[PDB]
Amino acid sequence: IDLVNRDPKHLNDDVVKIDFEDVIAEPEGTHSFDGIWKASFTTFTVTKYWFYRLLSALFGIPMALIWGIYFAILSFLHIWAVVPCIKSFLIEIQCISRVYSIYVHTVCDPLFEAVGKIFSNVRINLQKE
Amino acid sequence: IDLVNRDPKHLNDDVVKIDFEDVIAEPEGTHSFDGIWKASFTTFTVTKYWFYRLLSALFGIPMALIWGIYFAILSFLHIWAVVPCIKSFLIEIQCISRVYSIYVHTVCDPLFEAVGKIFSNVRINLQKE
Amino acid sequence: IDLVNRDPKHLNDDVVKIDFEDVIAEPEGTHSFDGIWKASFTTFTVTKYWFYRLLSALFGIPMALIWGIYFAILSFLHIWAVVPCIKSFLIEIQCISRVYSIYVHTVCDPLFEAVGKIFSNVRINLQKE
Amino acid sequence: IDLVNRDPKHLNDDVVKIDFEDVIAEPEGTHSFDGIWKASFTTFTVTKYWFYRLLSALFGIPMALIWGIYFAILSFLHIWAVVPCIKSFLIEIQCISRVYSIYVHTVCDPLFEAVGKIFSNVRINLQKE
Amino acid sequence: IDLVNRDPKHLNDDVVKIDFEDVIAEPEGTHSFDGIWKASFTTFTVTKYWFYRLLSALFGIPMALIWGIYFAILSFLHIWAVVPCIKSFLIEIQCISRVYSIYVHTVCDPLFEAVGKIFSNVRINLQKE
Amino acid sequence: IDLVNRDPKHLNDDVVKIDFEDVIAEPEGTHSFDGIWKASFTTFTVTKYWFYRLLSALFGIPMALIWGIYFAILSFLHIWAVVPCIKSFLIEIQCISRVYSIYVHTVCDPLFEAVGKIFSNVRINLQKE
Amino acid sequence: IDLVNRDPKHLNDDVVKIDFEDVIAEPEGTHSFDGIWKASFTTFTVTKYWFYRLLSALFGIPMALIWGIYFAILSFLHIWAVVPCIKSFLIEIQCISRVYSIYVHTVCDPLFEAVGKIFSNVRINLQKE
Amino acid sequence: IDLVNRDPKHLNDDVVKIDFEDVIAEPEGTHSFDGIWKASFTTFTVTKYWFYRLLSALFGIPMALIWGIYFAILSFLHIWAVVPCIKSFLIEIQCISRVYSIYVHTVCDPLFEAVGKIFSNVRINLQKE
Amino acid sequence: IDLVNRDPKHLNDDVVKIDFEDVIAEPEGTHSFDGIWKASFTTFTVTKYWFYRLLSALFGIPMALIWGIYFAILSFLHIWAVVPCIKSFLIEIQCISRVYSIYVHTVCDPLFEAVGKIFSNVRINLQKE
Amino acid sequence: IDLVNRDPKHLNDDVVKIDFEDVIAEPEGTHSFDGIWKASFTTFTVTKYWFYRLLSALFGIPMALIWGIYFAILSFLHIWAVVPCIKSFLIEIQCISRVYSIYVHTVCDPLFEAVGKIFSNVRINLQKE
Amino acid sequence: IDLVNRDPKHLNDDVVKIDFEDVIAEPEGTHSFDGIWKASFTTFTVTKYWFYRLLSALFGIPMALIWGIYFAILSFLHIWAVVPCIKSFLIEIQCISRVYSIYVHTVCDPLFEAVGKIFSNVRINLQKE
C-alpha cells in the first residue's frame, strides 16, 4: 500500500492536475492590491481541498463493489466462448474463398496487363549546362 | 500439467489482464482519507477473485464436451472432401482460360501500344546556379 | 507568495501586456508640441492604472469561490466514473470487429491486386549529353 | 509406408492442427480450482481423439474408390483432346490478326505523336542555398 | 521622455513617412523654370507642417482618455473569466471524443488498407547509354 | 523410340502428375487405424492405374488418324496462299497512308506546340538544414 | 536645392524619358534628303521643349497647395484612430477562435488519418543494366 | 537450287514446324501398353507425310503462274505513277501551311504563357535525421 | 548629326531591311537568260529607291510637329497628377485589408490542416538487384 | 549514264525488291517432289521478268513528257509569286499583334500569380534506416 | 552581278531543286531495255529546261515593277506612323493597371495561402535492403 505515489502508471496524470497558478495569473505591470492577492490564493486552495474529500467518502465505497461484479462476467465469456467461436469461423469459410479467387484471376487478369504497355517506350534526353 | 504458466502461447494475455491499479488512480494533491483508500482496494480485489471461481465450476466442464465433438466433424470433412474437390477444379477449367486470353491479346493489344508514344519526345534542360 | 513574478508559467503574457508606446507613436518629422506630448503620456498611464484596481477589488474575491466548487465536481467524475466506462467498452466490442475484418479481406482483396499489374512493365532509356 | 510422417508435403498442416492449449487459456491471476483444470484437459483430449477414428472407419474406404475413377477420366481427355485443339487454334487465326494490326497503326498513329510534343520545352532553374 | 526618437518600436514607420521628393520629381531634360521649382518646394513643406500641429492640439488630449478606460475593461475580463472557461471545456468533452474515435477506426480502417495494395508490384528497368 | 522418357519437352508435366500423397494427407496427432491407412493407399493406386489403360486401347488409335489429315490441310494453305496475300497488302496501301499523315501534321501540329510553353518558367529554391 | 539631379530616387525615370532618336529612326539604305533630316530633328526638339514649360507655369503652383492639405488629414487619422482600433480587435476575438478549433479537430481528424494508410505498402524493384 | 535448306530466310519457320512429340506426350507414371505406343507414332507420321505431297502436286504449279502476273502490275504503277504524285503534293501545299501557322502563334501564344507562372515560386525545406 | 549611322538604337532594324536578294533567288540549274537577270535587278532597286524619297518630302515635316505637341501633354499629367493619386490610394485602404485577413485565417485555417495528415505515413521499401 | 546502279539514292529500294525466295518457302520436313520444286522456281521468275518489260515499252515514254511540263509550271510560281507574298504578310500584321499582347498581360497576369503561392510552404522530413 | 551563285542566302534551295534521278528510279533486277532508258532520260531533262525559260521571259520583267512600288509604301508607314503610335499606348494605360493589381492582391491572396498548408506535414521512411 503506497500512500505516497498512489499512481505508478501515469494513467490519470494530464487533465486532472490543476493548481491555482494554472488558472489565474497577472504577468506584469497590471497588478492588484497586496491584500486582495493573498486572500484569493487561500480561498481557492482551501475550498476545493475539503470539498473533494466529502464526495469521496459518501459514495466512494458503494461504487467500487458495482464495478467488481461487472468485470468478472465479461472476463469469463471472452475466455470460454468468444475465442473458440472466432477460431472455428476460419475453418468453415475455406472452399468459398479459394473458388472465388480463381474466378477473378481468370477474367480480369489479361485486361489489366495490356493496359500497362503504355509505359514501355519512355525516352529521356538530358543536357547539362 | 503446468499449474504455474497455464498459457505458454500468449493468446489471451492483452485484454484479460485487469488489476485495481489499472482502473482507479489519484495522481497527486487530490487525495482521500487513509481509511477510505485502504478499504476500497480490498473490496475490489476480493469480490472479483471469488466470483470468477463460482462461474467456472458450475458450467465449466459441461461446456468443454460440446466443443470436443464439433471440432472433430470439421476436421474430417476438410481432409477427405474439400481438398480433393478444389484440386480437381483447376484441371477442368483449362480450355476456357487459354482461349479467352488469346482473344483479348488480339483485339486491344495494338490500341494501347500507339497511345504510349506520347512519352517518346521528352527533352529536359538544366542549368545549375 | 511571490509578489514580484506572479506568473511563473507565461500563460497570460502575450495579449495582456499593453503599454502607451505600443499604441501611439510618431516616427519622425511629423511631430507635435512639447506641451501636448508630455501631457497625453501621463493621462493614458495614470487612468488605466487606477481603474483596473477598482474592478479587481469589488468582485474579485466573490468570483474565486465559484470556480473552486465547480472544478471539484468535474475531477471526481472523471476519476471514478468515466475512466472505467471507457476501458470496459473495448472488451465488449471484440467479436464484431474480428468477424467484420475477415469478410472484407475475402471479397475485395483479389480485385485490387490484379489492378496493380499496370506498373510491372516500366522501361526507361536515358542518354546523357 | 511411412507410419510416422504420413505427410511429407505440408499440404494440410496449417488449419488442421488444433490442440487444447490453442483454444482455452488463462494467463495469470484469473485462475480456477485445481480439481477443475485437471478434469477439463482430459475430457477435451479424449473425446475428440476417439470420435475422429469412428468416422474414418465407417465411410473412409468407400470414398477413396469414387475419387479413383473420376481422376482417370479427366487425365485422358486433357492429353489426347484438349492439347491438340488449343494448338490448332493459333494457326487458324493468323490472317485476321495481321491485317487488323496494320489498319490500326495507319489511322491513329500520327494522332498520338503530335500530342506528345508538349514535353519538348522543359526548362528548370536550380539555386542551392 | 525621449523627444528625439519618439518611436523605438518601428510600428508606424512605413506608410506615414512622406516627403516632397517622394511625390513629385522631374528626372532629366524635362525641367521647369528656376523660379517655379524653388517656390513649389517651400509651399508644400510649410503648409503640411503647420496644419498637422493644429489638429493634434484641438482634439488630441480628449481622445487619449477614451482609449484608457476601454482597454482596462478588456484586460480584466480576459484574465479572470475567459481563461478559466476555456480550460474547463477540455475536461468536459472527453468521453465523446474517445468513443467516437474507436467507432471510426473499426469500420473504415480495413477498407482503405486493401486499396493500398496496388503499389506492391512496381518493377523498373533502367539502361544507361 | 524412348520408352523411359516419353516426354522430352515438358509440355504436359504440371497438371497431369497426380499421386495419392498429393490428395489425402493427415499431418500429425489426427491419425487413423493402421488397418485403414494401408488399405486406402492400395485401392486408390491400383484402380486408376488399370482404368487409364483400358480407355487408351479402345479409341486411342482411331483418334490419331483424324488429327493427321487435319494438320496437313492447314499447313498447305498457310505456305502457298496466306503468306503471299499479306505481303501484297502492304504495297497497295501506300498512297493513302502518306497523304493522310501530311494532312494531320499540318493542322494540329502548331496547336499542341504553344500549349507546351507552360513548363518553360520553372524555378526551384532549395535550402539544406 | 539640387538643380542638377532633381530626382535622387529614380521614381519617374522609365516612362518619362523620351528623345527624338527613340521615336523615328531609319536603319540603313532607306534614307532621305539631307535637307529633310536636319529640319525634322530641330522641329521636334524645340516644339516640345518650350510647350512643357508653359503648362508648368500656369497651374503648377496652385496645384501643389491642394495636395498639401489632403495628405495632412490622412496622416492624423492613421496614427491616432486606425492603429488602436485594429489592435483592440485581436483581444476581443479570442474565445470564438479557440472553441471553434477544438470542435473541428475532434470530428474530422480521425477520418483523414485512416485514408492515409494507402501509401504504407510501397515496394520497388530496381535492376540496373 | 538448294535442296537441303530450301528456306534461307526463316520466314515460315515458327508455326509450320509440327512433330508428333509436340502434340501428344505422357509425362510419367501414366503410361500405356507398349503395343499401342509404337503403333500410334507410326500412323501419325506416315499419314501426314504422304498427304501433303498429293496436294502440292495437283494444284501447286497452276497457282504459281497467277502470282507472277499480279506482282508485275503493282511494281510498275508504284515506280512511275505513285512516287511522282506524292512528291508534287508537297510543293502545292506551301502557302496554306505557312499562313495558318502565323495566325495560331499570334492569338493563343500569350494566353498559355501567363498560365505557366504558377511554378515560379517553389520553395522546399529539407532536414535530414 | 550623324549622317552615317542614323539609328544607334537598333529599334527599326529587323522588318524594314529588305534587299532584292532577299525576295527573288534561283538556286541552281533552273536559270534564266543573262539579258533578263541583269535587267530585273536594276528595275527593282531603282524604282523603290526614288519612290521612298518622294513620300518623305511631301508630308514628312508637317507630321513631326503633330507628335511634338501630343507627347508634351502626356508627360505633364503623369508627373503631377497620376503619381500622387496612386500613392494616396495605399494609405486609404489599410483598415479593410487588415480586418479581412484576420477573418479568413480564423475560419478556414484549421480545415486545411487536418486534410494534410494523409502524407504522414509514407513507407518505402527498396531492394537493389 | 550508269547502267549498273540506276538508283544512287535508295528512293525505291524497300517495297519494290521482291524475289521468289521471299514469297514461298518450305522450312524442313515438309518437302515436295524434286520435279515440282525445280519447275515452280523457273515459272515464277521467267513470267514476271518478261511481263514487266512489255509494259515499260508501250506507255513508258509518252508518260515522261507529261511530268516534264507539269513540274515547270509549279517551279515558276513558287519563286516569283508565293515567296514575296508570304514575306509581305509579316510586315502588315504588326500593330494588331503588339496591342493584343499588352491587353492580355494586363488582365490575367495577376490572377495566375497569386494561385502559385500554394507551393511556398513545402516541408519534408527524412529518416534513413 | 554573280552569274554562278545567284542565291547566297539558301532561301529557295529545298523544294525547288528537282532532278530526273529524284523522280524515277529502278533499284535492281527490275530493269528495262537499254533503248528505253537512254531515251526517257533525255526527254525529261530537255523539255523542262527550255519551257522554264519561255515563261521567265514573257512576264518576268513586268512583274518586278509591281513589287517595287508596293514595298515602298509599307516601309514608310511603319517607320513614321506605327512605331510612335504603339509607344504612346504604354504611357496612357498606367493608372488602370496599377489600381487593378492592388485590388486583386487584396482579396484572393489570403485564400490561396491557407490552402497551401496541406504539404507542411510530409514524413518519409526509407529502409535499404
Swiss-Prot record, chains A, B, C, D, E, F, G, H, I, J, K:
Ranges of the Cytoplasmic topological domain: 78-129
Record keywords, A-Z: Acetylation, Cell membrane, Congenital generalized lipodystrophy, Diabetes mellitus, Disease variant, Golgi apparatus, Host-virus interaction, Isopeptide bond, Lipoprotein, Membrane, Palmitate, Phosphoprotein, Ubl conjugation
Lipid attachment points (S-palmitoyl cysteine): 85, 95, 108
Coiled coil: none
Region named Interaction with CAVIN3: 34-46
Keyword Ubl conjugation: yes
Chief location of this protein within or outside the cell: Golgi
Entry function: May act as a scaffolding protein within caveolar membranes. Forms a stable heterooligomeric complex with CAV2 that targets to lipid rafts and drives caveolae formation. Mediates the recruitment of CAVIN proteins (CAVIN1/2/3/4) to the caveolae. Interacts directly with G-protein alpha subunits and can functionally regulate their activity. Involved in the costimulatory signal essential for T-cell receptor (TCR)-mediated T-cell activation. Its binding to DPP4 induces T-cell proliferation and NF-kappa-B activation in a T-cell receptor/CD3-dependent manner.
Family: Belongs to the caveolin family.
Designated name of the protein: Caveolin-1
Gene name linked to the record: CAV1
